[PDB]
Amino acid sequence: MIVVDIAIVLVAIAAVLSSYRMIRGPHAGDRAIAADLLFFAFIALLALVGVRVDSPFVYDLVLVATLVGLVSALSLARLMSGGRR
């Protein structure tokens, strides 16, 4: 499963770069779009890791993390707008 290790390292590098953007984000909204990209990269890492450590109960998490990487993203928008709708 060398392809899976390559994909894991690539997603980790992408996550590190996007987290650098999170840190040095000029406007508060960049630190939220980086959070969104990182949540999606973390779902990808969940899938790829569940491939590496061969597990049947992966996609439950994948079915839930998407309902989590969204509610935890919209709310960030709700925070950039100062709570105001």
Binding site: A14, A28, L48
Partner: protein
């Protein structure tokens, strides 16, 4: 030849494509001047790359009890990566995210 080796190689190339797309969407978060350019790139990258990784992972061990939980997950990932980026860009506009100096035309006032 076999009906499992095709799925294996397909999942492998799919997770590779998805990882490459994630890396491209992350590099976009670096060399992009605006918040709206960043969100326009992320709305596509975080969706396509993640759907590719999910489908490739599923092809690398295709269980039968996880097919609906992936068919739903793909659509949910697409819709969520669209809507999250949409609302992040909108809230950035409302909060006062200054558009880049290289904006040739804007039919929306910023004040």
């Amino acid at each position: 030849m076999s009906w499992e080796l095709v799925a294996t190689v397909l999942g492998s190339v799919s997770v590779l494509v998805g990882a490459v797309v994630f890396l491209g969407g992350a590099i976009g978060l670096l060399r992009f001047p605006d918040l709206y350019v960043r969100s326009s790139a992320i709305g596509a990258a975080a969706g396509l790359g993640l759907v590719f990784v999910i489908a490739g992972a599923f092809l690398l061990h295709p269980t039968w009890e996880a097919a609906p939980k992936v068919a739903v997950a793909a659509i949910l990932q697409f819709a969520s990566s669209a809507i999250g980026a949409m609302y992040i860009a909108r809230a950035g506009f409302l909060s006062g995210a200054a558009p880049t100096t290289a904006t040739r035309y804007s039919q929306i006032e910023f004040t």
